[PDB]
């Protein structure tokens, strides 16, 4: 019956994100997406009464690393789009890890658990690109990057957030399964074409 299995099976939407991130030499992002996929897949499988026999760790661990992995995937995809060089890249990666870890651990269902990562990462991106536009005296990411990556990526991002945090009360089983697909598609689009620091 589809009602049970859809949130479990549709978590495999993140597997194309892992393979595409690996293929573009975004290995650290592919770890976070694969970690997320594993903990999101098992969070839904362990929650589902018809296949809860599959899970081995406590529900508390799977639920925490489902939410933490999801929020960290949103951070590392936006910091990949930002495309910082060293020593800022490792510093901004660690800033997300440490602040999202404490925030999610303090309260995993409270406000700021996803709008913290997105709100902060888009402010960091805006400040970098506004400096780069004043420097270049022209639209910094090419109209290609806006119309192919940033526009579609943030549209699938906005779709994922409004599916999960508005429409999900209509039917969880279908709307949460479309959230996995919309968010995985957002992570594919926001991630650049090549990891220029490693390829």
């Amino acid at each position: 019956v589809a009602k049970l299995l859809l949130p479990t099976l549709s978590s495999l939407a993140f597997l194309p994100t892992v393979s595409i991130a690996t293929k573009r030499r975004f290995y650290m992002e592919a770890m976070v997406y694969l970690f997320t996929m594993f903990f999101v897949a098992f969070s839904h499988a362990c929650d589902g009464p018809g296949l809860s026999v599959l899970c081995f760790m406590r529900r508390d661990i799977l639920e925490y690393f489902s939410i933490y992995g999801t929020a960290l995937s949103m951070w590392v995809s936006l910091m990949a789009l930002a495309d910082f060089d060293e020593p800022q890249r490792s510093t901004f990666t660690m800033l997300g890890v440490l602040t999202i870890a404490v925030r999610t651990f303090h309260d995993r269902w409270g406000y700021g658990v996803y709008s913290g990562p997105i709100g902060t990462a888009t402010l960091i991106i805006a400040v970098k690109w506004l400096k780069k536009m004043k420097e270049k005296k022209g639209l910094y990411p090419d109209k290609s990057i806006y119309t192919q990556q940033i526009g579609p990526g943030l549209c699938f991002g906005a779709l994922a957030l409004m599916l999960r945090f508005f429409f999900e009360e209509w039917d969880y089983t279908y709307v949460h399964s479309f959230y996995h697909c919309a968010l995985a598609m957002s992570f594919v689009l926001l991630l650049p074409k090549v990891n220029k620091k490693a390829g």
Partner: antibody
Framework: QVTLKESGPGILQPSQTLSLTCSFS??????????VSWIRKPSGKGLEWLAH???????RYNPSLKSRLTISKDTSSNQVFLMITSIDTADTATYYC????????????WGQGTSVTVSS | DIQMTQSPSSLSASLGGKVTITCKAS??????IAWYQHKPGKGPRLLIH???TLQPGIPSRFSGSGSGRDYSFSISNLEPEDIATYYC?????????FGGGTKLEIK
């Protein structure tokens, strides 16, 4: 429609100074993100960039020539001026006036260029 | 300055054929390389911008590729109207530099 048209003296000698002018239409260069630039093709040689002037009256010059170029603007008549000082017979070229934009940062419209000669 | 060096200085070709020009930058120029077509007694035309983007109205036989110091430009289905001098432009910095130019010729 967009157009640029370069004009100048044609004949000079190395004691003298060069007063290049560039009339344009389709844009007025008071518009935000709009720019005009000067590029020159020396006699029997490839292109080299000289100078920029932007919408906000900001300016740039070639480090190799920075001392003896001054770029100016007049949007009252849609014109830009480049003044080149302390001339040498190395300045024998065609001088092009090219329009840059905000969305694509390279120049899109050029004029047909104007030739300058520097000999007795 | 950043040095832009086009590999063919001159390039002779058949009509209806295909050709490729390559250009090497002395630095990583972050895919900001425009390609221009110059004809005797005419102002140059912008054909391609960023690295691969054709200017609107330009025929789809012109194409360019590459990233990080190594960029390429190509004319397919080469017509006699494509016999011209082709320059690249590094435009990552507002210190603009052109490539040495490739004079295309009918063989």
């Amino acid at each position: 429609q967009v157009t640029l048209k370069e004009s100048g003296p044609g004949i000079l000698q190395p004691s003298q100074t060069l007063s290049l002018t560039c009339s344009f239409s389709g844009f007025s260069l008071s518009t935000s993100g709009m720019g005009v630039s000067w590029i020159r093709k020396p006699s029997g040689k490839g292109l080299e960039w000289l100078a920029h002037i932007f919408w906000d009256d900001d300016k740039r010059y070639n480090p190799s020539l920075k001392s003896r170029l001054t770029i100016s603007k007049d949007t009252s008549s849609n014109q830009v001026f480049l003044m080149i000082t302390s001339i040498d017979t190395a300045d024998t070229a065609t001088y092009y006036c090219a329009r840059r934009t905000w969305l694509l940062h390279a120049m899109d419209y050029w004029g047909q260029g104007t030739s300058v000669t520097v000999s007795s | 300055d950043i040095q832009m060096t086009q590999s063919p200085s001159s390039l002779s070709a058949s009509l209806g054929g295909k050709v490729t020009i390559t250009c090497k930058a002395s630095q990583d120029i972050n895919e900001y390389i425009a390609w221009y077509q110059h004809k005797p007694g005419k102002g140059p035309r912008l054909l391609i911008h960023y690295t691969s983007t054709l200017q609107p109205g330009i025929p789809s036989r012109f194409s360019g590729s590459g990233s990080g110091r190594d960029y390429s430009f190509s004319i397919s289905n080469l017509e006699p109207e494509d016999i011209a001098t082709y320059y690249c432009l590094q435009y990552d910095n507002l210190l603009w530099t052109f490539g040495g130019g490739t004079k295309l010729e009918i063989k």
